[PDB]
């Protein structure tokens, strides 16, 4: 157990840019003398990492953990020992513990109660003791344990000439936890702030915690009174980036270039080479990005009578299948998804899982009861008696079919004679039509009306149901839902709530399912009362009518344009210029903002003198008067 320390005068952490550290092998594959482009979580080049210095001096607060971290300690005498990972550290959530102090590396996953000051430092008098090793106050339920060999350690406590540099990168994804590591000796520098150079990182271990991680704590090594030596570490955060990596014939990573730092790096990435000759090149495409999202559904709050249809007392026979209309309500298919067994629920034109996100214009429910052997005949374009002479669906049917077993209700031990069906029909019937006329089948060469006999048949036949019948012949209840999509103003659909309306701004609009991106303005055209959506030459909707308020909105896409880079040879200076093809030059100052533009780099927009040509405006070059020969 630890003892309260306090008595700390905290000082804001230091900052220092990291030049080229933090690159690791992305896969366990050997490649020799080839440039490879990868996209994964990396450390951006020339990013400002946080510097912590501990000498009296005690600086080790909790730090956020998200999308993996890069931890680099420049140390000599093995002061930093382990790490703590967790989200609450209150014995209510699972927590990691990685301790490699002296014996081995111990990795424990358990509901630890980490005390206020986790450390192994303060012991009598100024030399370390392996006491308070139970930094966790309690361990209720521990679910993972793993032990392996330790790293390179050191003896005694020194102050100065800090040779060893240990770099680690930790990343968790899809439950897995991954650690890459590297050790560099003989790194002595009178100045601080990390060495300059390149060095790759190898994969060390992998382990499946499968838990939630959001913050981490560093560990280092009576309670009152202690003097500690020099120690320094640096913390940086990862993010998704694309890199170009160069291997050599020996199979080791030698150099790497970022592809989102500078326009010169962008053109290096797109040329797939580390040198570019003098000229004008075409690079990644400019494009502005959406700020907020809006939705718009009709103002209806009633409920659809699906319960009455699915809990009806009596179902009509096949030759008189019942048809009902659902309109002007809110349909929730969740109750249909779970309640009752519903042994068959199969849709054709739309995946049922998304059925709660669309909007329809007319919904028709057709209900009947059939035998268990004919349920497979409900599919469109089928054959057989029931799919030909009693009920047939069109080939392009767009809806759903639900069939479930109802042996308890319809079947009767004495015998259920109430159910009838046509057995003889003169010719195949058109889709979605009904036949009721009772005319004796004159299937012979004689003018027979009669009652019964040869070639004189009563077409109707009676289903008979009883519990003694085996599986495959007990009655099944079938309901078919049919609808057409997007062709008319919506009338019935799901319960998604609406929001406000935005004008003259780039948003992610959603009008009755029309997911899209663009800017919405007020139009000056007139619609017909039976029209809702306006199309164009390319058959892409560009005029919409708001459902809640009867207004006409016109959609236009976001601003964009080409980008070119003017550069002298890489053998000469690395200064470059940028040209925004075919755009007025007052839009790009407006575009200046973070998280707004596809090209992450934006230092050049507020750069040197801007000069408008007839093909955009050039930024980064001054306009002289006298004329030369074209270069």
């Amino acid at each position: 157990q630890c003892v309260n320390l306090t008595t700390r005068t905290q000082l804001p952490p230091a900052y220092t840019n990291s030049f080229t550290r933090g690159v690791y092998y992305p896969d366990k594959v050997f490649r020799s003398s080839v440039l490879h482009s990868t996209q994964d979580l990396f450390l951006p080049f020339f990013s400002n990492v946080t510097w912590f210095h501990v000498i009296k001096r005690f600086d080790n607060p909790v730090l956020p953990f998200n999308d993996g971290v890069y931890f680099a300690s420049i140390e000599k005498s093995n002061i930093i020992r382990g790490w703590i990972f967790g989200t609450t550290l209150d014995s209510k959530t699972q927590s990691l513990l990685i301790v490699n102090n002296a014996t081995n590396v111990v990795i424990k996953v358990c509901e630890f109660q980490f005390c206020n000051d986790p450390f192994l430092d303060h012991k009598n008098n100024k030399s370390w003791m392996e006491s308070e090793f139970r930094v966790y106050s309690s361990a209720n339920n521990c679910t993972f344990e793993y032990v392996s060999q330790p790293f390179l350690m050191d003896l005694e406590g020194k102050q100065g000439n800090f040779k060893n540099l240990r770099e680690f990168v930790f990343k968790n994804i899809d439950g897995y936890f991954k650690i890459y590591s590297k050790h560099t000796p003989i790194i002595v520098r009178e100045p601080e702030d990390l060495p300059q150079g390149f060095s790759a990182l190898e994969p060390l271990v992998d382990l499946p915690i499968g838990i939630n991680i959001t913050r981490f704590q560093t560990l280092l090594a009576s309670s009152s009174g202690w003097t500690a030596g020099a120690a320094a570490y640096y913390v940086g955060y990862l993010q998704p980036r694309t890199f170009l990596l160069k291997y050599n014939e020996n199979g080791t990573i030698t150099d790497a270039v970022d592809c989102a730092l500078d326009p010169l790096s962008e053109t290096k990435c797109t040329l797939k080479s580390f040198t570019v000759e003098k000229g004008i090149y075409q690079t990644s495409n400019f494009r502005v990005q959406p700020t907020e999202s809006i939705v718009r559904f009709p103002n209806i709050t009633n409920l659809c009578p699906f319960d009455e249809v699915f809990n009806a007392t009596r179902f009509a026979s096949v030759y008189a299948w019942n048809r009902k209309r659902i309109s002007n309500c809110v349909a929730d298919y969740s109750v249909l998804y779970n309640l009752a067994p519903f042994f068959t629920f199969k849709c054709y034109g739309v995946s049922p899982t998304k059925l709660n996100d669309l909007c329809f214009t007319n919904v028709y429910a057709d209900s009947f009861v059939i035998r268990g052997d004919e349920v497979r005949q409900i599919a469109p374009g089928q054959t057989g008696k029931i799919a030909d002479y009693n009920y047939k669906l069109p080939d392009d049917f767009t809806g759903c079919v639900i069939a479930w077993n109802s042996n308890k209700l319809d079947s009767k031990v004495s015998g259920n004679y109430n159910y009838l069906y046509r057995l003889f029909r003169k010719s195949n019937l058109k889709p979605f039509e009904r036949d009721i006329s009772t005319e004796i089948y004159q299937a012979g060469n004689k003018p027979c009306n009669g009652v019964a006999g040869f070639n004189c048949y009563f077409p109707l036949r009676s289903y008979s149901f009883r519990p003694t019948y085996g599986v495959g012949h007990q009655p099944y209840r079938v309901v078919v839902l049919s609808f057409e999509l997007l062709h008319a103003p919506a009338t019935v659909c799901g319960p998604k709530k609406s929001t406000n309306l935005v004008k003259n701004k780039c948003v992610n609009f959603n009008f009755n399912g029309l997911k899209g991106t663009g800017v919405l303005t007020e139009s000056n055209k007139k619609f017909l009362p039976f029209q809702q959506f306006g199309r164009d030459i390319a058959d892409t909707t560009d005029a919409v009518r708001d459902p809640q308020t009867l207004e006409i909105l016109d959609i236009t896409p976001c601003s964009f344009g080409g980008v070119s880079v003017i550069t002298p040879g890489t053998n000469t200076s690395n200064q470059v210029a940028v040209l925004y093809q075919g755009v007025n030059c007052t839009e790009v100052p407006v575009a200046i903002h973070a998280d707004q533009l596809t090209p992450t780099w934006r230092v050049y927009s507020t750069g040197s003198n801007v000069f408008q040509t007839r093909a955009g405006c050039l930024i980064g070059a001054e306009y002289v008067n006298n004329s030369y020969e074209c270069d």
Binding site: T556, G582, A615
Partner: peptide
């Protein structure tokens, strides 16, 4: 700075669909 025949030549040869060319189709200048 044009002659007389060049004026007729320019006027006798003609060069809103560009608005509906939003689909990534441009025309660079000579």
């Amino acid at each position: 700075k044009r002659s007389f025949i060049e004026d007729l030549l320019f006027n006798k040869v003609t060069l809103l669909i560009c608005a509906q060319k939003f689909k990534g189709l441009t025309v660079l200048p000579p």
